[PDB]
Design a protein around this ligand. Sequence first.
Ligand SMILES: NC(=O)c1ccc[n+]([C@@H]2O[C@H](COP(=O)([O-])OP(=O)(O)OC[C@H]3O[C@@H](n4cnc5c(N)ncnc54)[C@H](OP(=O)(O)O)[C@@H]3O)[C@@H](O)[C@H]2O)c1
Lengths: 309, 112
Amino acid sequence: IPHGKGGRSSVSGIVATVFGATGFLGRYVVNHLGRMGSQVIVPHRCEPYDTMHLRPMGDLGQIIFMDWNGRDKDSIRRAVEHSSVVINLVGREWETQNFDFEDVFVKIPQAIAQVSKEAGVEKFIHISHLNADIKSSSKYLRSKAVGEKEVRETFPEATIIKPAEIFGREDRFLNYFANIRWFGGVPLISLGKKTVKQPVYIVDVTKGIINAIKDPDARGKTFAFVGPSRYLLFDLVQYVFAVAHRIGRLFEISPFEPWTTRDKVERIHTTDKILPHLPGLEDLGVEATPLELKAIEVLRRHRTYRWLS
Amino acid sequence: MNLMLALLTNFTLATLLVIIAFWLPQLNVYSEKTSPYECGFDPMGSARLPFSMKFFLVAITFLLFDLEIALLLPLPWASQTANLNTMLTMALFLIILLAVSLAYEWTQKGLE
Ligand SMILES: NC(=O)c1ccc[n+]([C@@H]2O[C@H](COP(=O)([O-])OP(=O)(O)OC[C@H]3O[C@@H](n4cnc5c(N)ncnc54)[C@H](OP(=O)(O)O)[C@@H]3O)[C@@H](O)[C@H]2O)c1
């Protein structure tokens, strides 16, 4: 039962759990539950020290850590047993040399769609992507739209989410560009045609969840995440050079964490804007954020002073 | 022919060792945020380097005392001669031509 005011050292009655919640997105959600009060049980896989930069997030005795693997059907059953809502951001980019990547969007999101359904969670949540279509594309972009089909079977109430290409602070989406000091900028594939997608700013997505986190009355009913206006140009790849003025890694280096001459180059140009009929955002709002104004901040390079844009 | 073998040997250990230190973890997968937090403990510092003179003269002031102690250098080869008086009478001139050039300026060093 919610008490007092939402500042910090308050209650607001919701527990949570957030799986993943180390890399770019998950760190940036929990930080919005280390404010309005919660009990955020964040588990994590292998990382003892990479999770510390998080801890001054909840006040005291709010967030609490566990250890888990995720192919063991117990590790997801020991935590969640006490919970209210549980969202899931889990999953990543390139196929691992260990995890074969095929069912890590299939078996894992179900492996946590195991006893969670049984044990009496509620308002369970999962992530989708605006561009994933079960027609043939794209080797990574596929297997994600399987979860929308395969996993939706379980837990009839989901409110599974469908956002666009997002640009954060430390994000890897718009940052693959401007790291491209290289033989030259070569668009994908050397064509200025279908760029760009709906680049929503990471705050609005992470303010969507906690707006649906007790919504109320969105369960089973999936939503998709509007971008700003409107579609976009080739200039986005020029815009990068317009202003820029031209976890658990290792001790020394990582052997392979590449640019992936594979799905990566073709995942960025898949565009496929899709169905409007999803509610999907202002209803869950109120948020929408532009690009032109918010792209200076995340972009700071070797002038570090001049802008005049 | 073995000198250059003893020089480009030396740099090539040094010009190697920059990359195996600077560069090797430089491409490591850690965070390395671009934030303009760098340039320690004088956070912003927007100015030109102003002309400050008594910094300057201590350049010039040396450069001239420098020359003649190249002129002064071939004494110990010249100590072997025929008529030597033209040495001692002459050798001792340069020095006193050096030491004079002090005494004048010595009225004003300023804060050096
Ligand atoms: N909605 C979108 O716009 C969008 C865009 C790009 C990608 N995605 C996908 O939607 C989710 C957003 O992820 P993100 O933005 O937070 O980036 P992310 O770097 O993939 O974050 C995932 C975190 O969970 C970890 N992880 C990877 N595989 C795991 C597994 N089987 N089990 C447990 N943890 C695993 C990752 O490394 P650790 O195991 O060390 O924790 C990382 O810590 C991901 O699934 C991503 O593939 C979505």
